[PDB]
Amino acid sequence: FSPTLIADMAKIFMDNYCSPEKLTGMEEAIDAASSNTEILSISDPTMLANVLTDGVKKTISDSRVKVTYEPDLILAAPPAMPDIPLEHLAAMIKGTVKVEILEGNIGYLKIQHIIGEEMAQKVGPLLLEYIWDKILPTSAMILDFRSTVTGELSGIPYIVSYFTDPEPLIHIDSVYDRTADLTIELWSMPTLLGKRYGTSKPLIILTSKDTLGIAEDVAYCLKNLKRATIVGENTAGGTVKMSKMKVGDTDFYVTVPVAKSINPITGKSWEINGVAPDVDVAAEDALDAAIAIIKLRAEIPALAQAAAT
Amino acid sequence: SLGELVEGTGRLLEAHYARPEVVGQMGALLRAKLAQGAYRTAVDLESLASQLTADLQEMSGDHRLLVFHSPGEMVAEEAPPPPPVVPSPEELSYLIEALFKTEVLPGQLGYLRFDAMAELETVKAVGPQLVQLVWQKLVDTAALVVDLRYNPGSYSTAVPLLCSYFFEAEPRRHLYSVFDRATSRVTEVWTLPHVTGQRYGSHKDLYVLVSHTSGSAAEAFAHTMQDLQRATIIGEPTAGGALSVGIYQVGSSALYASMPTQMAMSASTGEAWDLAGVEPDITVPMSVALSTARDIVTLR
Amino acid sequence: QAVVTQESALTTSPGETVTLTCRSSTGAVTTSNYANWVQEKPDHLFTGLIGGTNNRAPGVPARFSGSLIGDKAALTITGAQTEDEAIYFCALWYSNHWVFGGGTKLTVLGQPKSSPSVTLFPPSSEELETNKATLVCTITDFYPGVVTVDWKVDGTPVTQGMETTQPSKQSNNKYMASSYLTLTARAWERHSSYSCQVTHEGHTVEKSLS
Amino acid sequence: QVQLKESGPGLVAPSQSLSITCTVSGFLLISNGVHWVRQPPGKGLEWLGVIWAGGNTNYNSALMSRVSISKDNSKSQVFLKMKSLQTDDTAMYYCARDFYDYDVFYYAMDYWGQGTSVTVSSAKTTPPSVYPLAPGSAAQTNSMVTLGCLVKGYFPEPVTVTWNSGSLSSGVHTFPAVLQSDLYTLSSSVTVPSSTWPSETVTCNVAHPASSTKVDKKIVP
Amino acid sequence: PTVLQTAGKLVADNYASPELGVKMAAELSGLQSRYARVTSEAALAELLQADLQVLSGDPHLKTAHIPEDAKDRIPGIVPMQIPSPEVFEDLIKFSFHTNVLEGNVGYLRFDMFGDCELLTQVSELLVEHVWKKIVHTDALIVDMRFNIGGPTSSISALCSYFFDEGPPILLDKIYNRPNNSVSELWTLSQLEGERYGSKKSMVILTSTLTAGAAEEFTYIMKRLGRALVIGEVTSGGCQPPQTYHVDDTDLYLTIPTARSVGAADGSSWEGVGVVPDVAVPAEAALTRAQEMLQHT
Amino acid sequence: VIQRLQEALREYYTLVDRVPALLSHLAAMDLSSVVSEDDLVTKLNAGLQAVSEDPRLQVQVVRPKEASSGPEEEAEEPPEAVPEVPEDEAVRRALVDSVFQVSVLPGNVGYLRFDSFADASVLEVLGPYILHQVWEPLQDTEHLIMDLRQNPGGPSSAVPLLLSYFQSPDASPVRLFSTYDRRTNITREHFSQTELLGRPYGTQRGVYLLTSHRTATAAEELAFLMQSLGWATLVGEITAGSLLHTHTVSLLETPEGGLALTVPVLTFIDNHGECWLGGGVVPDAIVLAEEALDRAQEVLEFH
Secondary structure, three states, X not given: OOOHHHHHHHHXXXXXXXXXXXXXXXXXXXXXXXXXXXXXXXXXXXXXXXXXXXXXXXXXXXXXXXXXXXXXXXXXXXXXXXXXXXXXXXXXXXXOEEEEEEOOOEEEEEEOEXXXXXXXXXXXXXXXXXXXXXXXXXXXXXXXXXXXXEEOHHHHHHHHHOOOOOOOOOEEEEEEEOOOOEEEEEEOOOOOOOOOOOOOXXXXXXXXXXXOOHHHHHHHHHHHOOOOEEEEOOOOOOOOEEEEEEOOOOOEEEEEEEEEEOOOOOOOOOOOOOOOOOEEOOHHHHXXXXXXXXXXXXXXXXXXXXHHX | OHHHHHHHHHHHHHHHOOOHXXXXXXXXXXXXXXXXXXXXXXXXXXXXXXXXXXXHHHHHOOOOOEEEXXXXXXXXXXXXXXXXXXXXXXXXHHHHXXXXXXXXXXXXXXXXXXXXXXXXXXXXXXXXXXXXXXXXXXXXXXXXXXXXXXXXXXOOOOHHHHHHHHOOOOOOOEEEEEEEOOOOOOEEEEOOOOOOOOOOOOOOEEEEEEOOOOOHHHHHHHHHHHHOOOOEEEEOOXXXXXXXXXXXXXXXXXXXXXXXXXXXXXXXXXXXXXXXXOOOOEEOOOOOHHHHHHHHHHEO | OOOEEEOOEEEEXXXXXXXXXXXXXXXXXXXHHOOEEEEEEOOOEEEEEEEOOOEEOOOOOXXXXXXXXXXXXXXXXXXXXXXXXXXXXXXXXXXXXXXXXXXXXXXXOOOOXXXXXXXXXXXXXXXXXXXXXXXXXXXXXXXXXXXXXXXXXXXXXXXXXXXXXXXXXXXXXXXXXXXXXXXXXXHHHHOOOEEEXXXXXXXXXXXXXX | OOEEEEEOOOEEOOOOXXXXXXXXXXXXXXXXXXXXXXXXXXXXXXXXXXXXXXOOEEEOOOOOOOEEEEEEOXXXXXXXXXXXXXXXXXXXXXXXXXXXXXXXXXXXXXXXXXXXXXXXOOOOOEOOEEEEEOOOOOOOOOOEEEEEEEEEEXXXXXXXXXXXXXXXXOOEEEOOOEEOOOOEEEEEEEEEEOOOOOOOOEEEEEEEHHHOEEEEEEEOO | OHHHHHHHHHHHHHOOOHHHOOOHHHXXXXXXXXXXXXXXXXXXXXXXXXXXXXXXXXXXXXXXXXXXXXXXXXXXXXXXXXXXXXXXXXHHHOOEEXXXXXXXXXXXXXXXXXXXXXXXXXXXXXXHHHHHHHOOOOEEEEEOOOOOEOOHHHHHHHHHOOOOOOOOOEEEEEEEOOOOEEEEEEOOOOOOOOOOOOOOEEEEEEOOOOOOHHHHHHXXXXXXXXXXXXXXXXXXXXXXXXXXXXXXXXXXXEEEOEEEOOOOOOXXXXXOOOOOOEEOOHHHHHHHHHHHHHHO | OHHHHHHHHHHHOOOHHHHHHHHHHHHHOOOOOOOOHHHHHHXXXXXXXXXXXXXXXXXXXXXXXXXXXXXXXXXXXXXXXHHHOOOOHHHHHHHHHHHEEEEEXXXXXXXXXXXXXXXXHHHHHHHHHHHHHHHOHHHHOOEXXXXXXXXXXXXXXXXXXXXXXXXXXXXOOOEEEEEEEOOOOOOEEEEOOOOOOOOOOOOOOEEEEEEOOOOOOHHHHHHHHHHHOOOOEEEEOOOOOOOOOEEEEEOOOHHHOOEEEXXXXXXXXXXXXXXXXXXXXXXXXXXXXXXXXXXXXHHHHOO
């Protein structure tokens, strides 16, 4: 063990935590913890991990930060792979989406995985006809994120851009990564492969309590941009990036949020609390409600013109 | 209820209404409303007062003749210097100094302010001292401002005497005729041929300042000065509170009728003054009236 | 107010005409009062005879008629029969309620007279144990329905202790009644002859015991 | 055929409530109104109220407050609720049908029920004592002998008297009841061939419904 | 007080429009003690000036206090010799520019309108120099863009060369209040020179500086429908003002003393000036006149 | 909801002239704060009242706990029906005598009470008998008290006929009100009748109408019209506010939990040109219902 252990955990935490400005008093609690003889009296490594974990809680107020003792932890490395041609990547993407026109000429696109910039640039031309051209002529659009739990940050501009004006460029999100000490800015793209959907047609996004990750960010941003109505349940409240980090040559690990979104409109984030629906309904009922909203609103102009004269 | 008021109202009007020539026509019309069925729509004191007030205004045009709730029956008569409280020592000059504020404004403009009209019996005792405080000090001025913006009036007994300071010494000027219906008054009211102290005279410019709080005898003075074309009246429409009416309660009800018993006919115009406020020649808020009087003097 | 009055008793004989009247306290009886005439027969048998002033119900004899006689409603029986003997009620409608009159008791003379059957019963031994003794005098099959029963203990007329029922109609239209003499067991044993004497229309029927 | 039958409680205490039912048959309540009428002992008839087909009711104003009439169309029942009883509410209560569909309009009470007797009293229910009435004078009067049963000290009415469980229907007389200090007393007699009694037994069976009591008395010489 | 009365008399006796003076005698009588408290002569003049403005609505009326005023009297000329008609013609040559522009268009710039006497006596000496040069042109441009001076009696001479001889035209009517006299300006049937005729286009050029009798000729020619006005709205002069001393005092009253009453429209060129038919900057007015004439 | 509401209003709301402005404003509201029926009702109700000032137009949801039933009315009144009127004249007089209670109060004051308004088809049949019960007995009186405190109304079809007993017999008839039903183009002027059966009470004698909070439908219309024409003094409580001038339109939006909208389809314009919005007749002399008869007597005594 040693007191060295505490010092080395602390450095990992301090060097990587996404919000260093909130760490007043931390260096001091580290010093105290290193000389706390009750801590020094712990021989059980799992008890040591639990104690340090609760100690940081009563110091930092962030429930995502944890120390664990994990002997026998092996992380599954990415699998070995031959060349995968673009046509087979396109077939894999087809398997993660459901594209449909629902009665009423309403576009439906269920997206299980938000694809990243590389994939979108390289395989997108192979999917244009299959996904996008099918739903382009619809009068309204429903994006179904109710079961979306994975995705890439770099895909966000590709979704938002199709639903917004080319000009002015929109600053969609700003993400800070503490480990890289870098801010990543996400902007709309004035030129796209496909045609824009326009700004007039209704866009509704369906959400569930399971909706997690980049999908929460897409919904949050389109909501704050006043482009989309959110229908369903409050989303899960994920984190842009967690890292689980080994402490030296020891079996202790520090788990820390290392990146965060700082929304250009709200100043806040989708993270932790998730995104609140505009129309709150059970997730199983979200699709029916979205359809009903779109249908009613489309009826309004004709109603008005009959009443006016 | 409706006949109880109507029978009392007719009897009150016949005996006391200042325009007796209107009574024959009122006696025809007021009871006509019952027989032709008009009085089958009113079943409250408020409805009775509103219906009769509308019908009375249509037949008379006289805003002094009005039916109201007994809660709205005047307030009380004004309380100004009584003769029984007048000091005997000739340092009574001090009382006159505080009753009448006299200034000589830049440009040789007289300013006279006083905020009540005492009874003529009070004015008789104070007259020798009034010479020193008002009449002599304003002799040098070429124009006079009389401020009545704070004057709630009183008794009109000294109004002919005060007005006489602004006329010729030897003319005998008709001011107004009072027709009291409760008797047969028909009393012409004239200027006095002699006043105590120096008259201001009929030539020098006179401006009378008025407000919404200007009342009774002060309204009568402002009105007579206007009607005789002697002074320009400046400020707000006056209170409308003259002593030309009496109040008659309607027995067994919460209503009354206020009735003019007196007509005031102005001498120089022939006009019947139906009160309701003096209307100024130059209508301005009360605060602006002194500035306005100065502007008229400057650009004459 | 809205008090309906009728004669209280009338008497006729068979073949004569009788008129019963019904008056409203409130004013003249009119068509709008829809005078109804109801007949009460022994042991609360009510039968509607005339409705709406002059409409005879279908099952009613043609000898019954109703009319407005001046200011009152009238029921006329032309050629009265012994079976017309009943109580007649008048009822008047007053826009929201009905008011019944007091009823007229009609007696038809010439009825067939019947003399009473008398039975005298001694106190039971079972009852004597209780220290009371009741003598029971039953009277049946008499007409008209009014008797007078006198009791005598040892030749001496009894003044107290007797109770007589009000005559009741039997199925056969004749009447019945019962008279009770209650003594104490002691008194019962102190005397010897007991007599129940029933007086019906001038005649006397007495029964005795020892 | 048109029938109306009343059923009520028999005995009720002063200051309490009264509920009576009129069960009709032969006509529908959805089409005909029903009236409630009462007859106090040794008094004339008194109208209480009516409930029309449509449900509107009208009451004798004198009673107005204490009375309430209602019905059950499906059940063919009309009910009368009467409160604040006094002993002067003692009466025969009747239901009668309302009719007006005549050649000329008029209202009539056309068919009357048989009535139900209500006794309003604070007196206590008391079962009867039954005594046999035997001739005493056992001398042959003729071919028949007349026997009886004395039903003494019961409250309230009625009592039922049967002879040999209804078998003897033969000149049976049940006399009216006398009331002395709130206790009724009545007799019943039977006439039988003298050759028969006492050879063959004669029994009177008395039932007092209000006390759920049954007594049988064998009449012996 | 005498000063106010003496001032008011000179205003009342000489104002060009006496019919608009209802109330004026009463306001003159309205001598204020505030006015009598003024010891500063310039402040007295400013105050009476503003007083008249809130009573008469004419901004040309003014009272001024002017010690040390000396008006320049007409120079001595006769003592040195009679100005001969030949030197007067040479002086008029210096107030005109006479040209035939490309397109056969006459151009005549006139810096000073010259009176009836000067026109009757010296015109004969300028007939060949001015008029005969531009007679044969197809169209005519009168440039008044810098004309700021001129006598009234000249107007007949300019108008008459550009209208028919018959019927005589009543060009203007001018009322002078001090003289109590209406002066009528008419066309003249017989002229020294040949008429230009009524067919050839006449354009008059105007600027915001164009002032006085030049505005009247432009106004009259425009109202007669003979000339098109090209340029800016004219200055809006008055036919005569008079600046008049009050008794032996250093106070002066400055008053419009005559006015035009146009026969056609009942109105005047005065004050508001003359509106152009074609509105353009004054520097561009000549180019536009040439363009309009060439297109027609 | 919003779509269905705008459609319902355009085709059925009595004040058609307010539809253009409503169609402009309703779609422009901020609806990103409301996510419940109760909220939607409350929000639209506040906006509708601000724009219309018409309390008759109101969104209302069922009890949220039992959504199959709500605050959408109860049921139409059942008075005497024409198919249930007796044929016999005695019965008809007797029925009229219980429908209308007539008293001559001390001081020669007529009292008339009746507690329903039947259809004019029923009043036609009863008219000859009403002459005997009502119109003749009150002829002797100098003032009349009409007690409607227990009258829940019924059809308004006989209201013009009843009113005409308190009007001049002559021709032309008097204008009572004008109906404007938006669902069609009614604009029907309703007038008094030039002839009545039996003696009219006339237009001169004092008339006092007693009202309660239970006074409803046709009884409220009769009281309001006697007041609007200045023919009688109304005394008692503010009436129930139940007039037959509206219709209820369900929102087929079950997500919105049992909502409906009550819409006035009819405008009632009186003889003074005032639109009556119902919500209750307001008495001239407001008192509790128990005090109304005493108050009418006081007004009569001190006239």
